[PDB]
Design an enzyme around this catalytic site. Structure first.
Site, mmCIF file in Angstrom:
data_model
loop_
_atom_site.group_PDB
_atom_site.id
_atom_site.type_symbol
_atom_site.label_atom_id
_atom_site.label_comp_id
_atom_site.label_asym_id
_atom_site.label_seq_id
_atom_site.Cartn_x
_atom_site.Cartn_y
_atom_site.Cartn_z
ATOM 1 N N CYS A 192 37.730 40.821 34.279
ATOM 2 C CA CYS A 192 36.901 41.666 35.133
ATOM 3 C C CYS A 192 35.720 42.244 34.350
ATOM 4 C CB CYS A 192 37.753 42.801 35.714
ATOM 5 S SG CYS A 192 36.992 43.748 37.046
ATOM 6 N N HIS B 18 39.696 38.764 44.741
ATOM 7 C CA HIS B 18 39.448 39.638 43.597
ATOM 8 C C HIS B 18 38.377 40.670 43.970
ATOM 9 C CE1 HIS B 18 38.722 40.235 39.078
ATOM 10 N NE2 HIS B 18 37.720 40.877 39.652
ATOM 11 N N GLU B 19 37.308 40.223 44.624
ATOM 12 C CA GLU B 19 36.258 41.156 45.015
ATOM 13 C C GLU B 19 36.705 42.086 46.137
ATOM 14 O OE1 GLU B 19 34.170 41.326 42.887
ATOM 15 O OE2 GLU B 19 34.538 39.335 42.030
ATOM 16 N N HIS C 219 38.453 45.012 44.882
ATOM 17 C CA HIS C 219 37.599 46.078 44.363
ATOM 18 C C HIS C 219 37.197 47.089 45.422
ATOM 19 C CE1 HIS C 219 37.128 45.147 40.196
ATOM 20 N NE2 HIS C 219 36.572 43.964 40.394
HETATM 21 O O1 LIG Z 1 34.571 41.850 40.287
HETATM 22 C C1 LIG Z 1 33.956 40.996 39.672
HETATM 23 N N1 LIG Z 1 34.196 40.652 38.380
HETATM 24 O O2 LIG Z 1 34.916 41.488 37.511
HETATM 25 C C2 LIG Z 1 33.674 39.369 37.909
HETATM 26 C C3 LIG Z 1 34.804 38.353 37.727
HETATM 27 O O3 LIG Z 1 35.363 38.014 39.002
HETATM 28 C C4 LIG Z 1 36.427 37.074 39.060
HETATM 29 C C5 LIG Z 1 37.058 36.672 40.268
HETATM 30 C C6 LIG Z 1 38.119 35.734 40.253
HETATM 31 C C7 LIG Z 1 38.564 35.189 39.031
HETATM 32 C C8 LIG Z 1 37.949 35.578 37.811
HETATM 33 C C9 LIG Z 1 38.425 34.995 36.538
HETATM 34 O O4 LIG Z 1 38.799 35.740 35.635
HETATM 35 C C10 LIG Z 1 38.423 33.518 36.331
HETATM 36 C C11 LIG Z 1 39.626 32.919 35.856
HETATM 37 C C12 LIG Z 1 39.736 31.530 35.621
HETATM 38 C C13 LIG Z 1 38.634 30.685 35.858
HETATM 39 C C14 LIG Z 1 37.330 31.300 36.371
HETATM 40 C C15 LIG Z 1 37.274 32.694 36.589
HETATM 41 C C16 LIG Z 1 36.891 36.520 37.839
HETATM 42 NI NI NI Z 2 36.308 42.381 38.936
#
Ligand SMILES: O=CN(O)CCOc1cccc(C(=O)c2ccccc2)c1
Ligand code: NI
Length: 192
Positions: A119, A162-163, A166
């Protein structure tokens, strides 16, 4: 006002605009936006997407000291509004700025990335399988107040959840099995 300075035409979102763990905002439930959207709310979504594209550009990310990202939620910019941006590379497997996104249906089957998750608001590595729904049907509105209903699977499904987490005050590690971080439960699909 965070949204006020971030939406200035000259402003480029960078890591200094992204709040980290400890900040109460990341654990608060974001407020829904009303329609019609204000110009600032539209610009914010556009600034957020711009940031994701900048974070995925070698030269640009280097110059701005940006961490690569495939998604971003307004709360991370200390703006408690239900607005998220997603940009998943394939040009793009998924590109969307979503207002008031909501999961309206989900599979019984679960899924987790075999590499775990990270994150932008988390400056540390937390190993483990982030357990999410394998597939989701998501409703959201675009900048024009037009409703969209999409179905996601694989990587896109994970990113959007994931978003959405948040804007509900949930962090990725909240879905990792404390006991055995890499435990494979029945019905869990590991992606890789
Ligand atoms: O809220 C937004 N963020 O913190 C940005 C990251 O968002 C995300 C959303 C979903 C997954 C990831 C990963 O950590 C990931 C794992 C394996 C392969 C590719 C990505 C990051
Ligand atoms: Ni995040």
């Amino acid at each position: 006002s965070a949204i006020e300075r971030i939406s200035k035409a000259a402003h480029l979102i960078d890591m200094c605009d992204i709040i980290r763990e400890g900040n109460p905002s990341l654990r608060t439930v974001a407020e829904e936006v009303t329609f019609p959207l204000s110009d600032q709310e539209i610009i914010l979504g556009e600034k957020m997407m711009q940031f994701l594209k900048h974070s995925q550009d070698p030269v640009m990310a280097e110059k701005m000291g940006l961490r690569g990202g495939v998604g971003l939620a307004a709360p991370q910019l200390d703006i408690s509004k239900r607005i998220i941006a997603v940009l998943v590379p394939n040009a793009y497997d998924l590109e969307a700025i979503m207002y008031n996104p909501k999961i309206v249906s989900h599979s019984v089957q679960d899924a987790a990335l075999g590499e775990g998750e990270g994150c932008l608001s988390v400056d540390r590595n937390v190993p483990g399988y982030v357990v999410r729904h394998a597939r989701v049907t998501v409703d959201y509105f675009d900048k024009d107040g037009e409703k969209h209903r999409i179905k996601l699977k694989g990587y896109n499904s994970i990113v959007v959840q994931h978003e959405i987490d948040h804007i509900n005050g949930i962090m990725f590690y909240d879905r990792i099995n404390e006991k055995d971080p890499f435990a494979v439960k029945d019905g869990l699909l590991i992606l890789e």
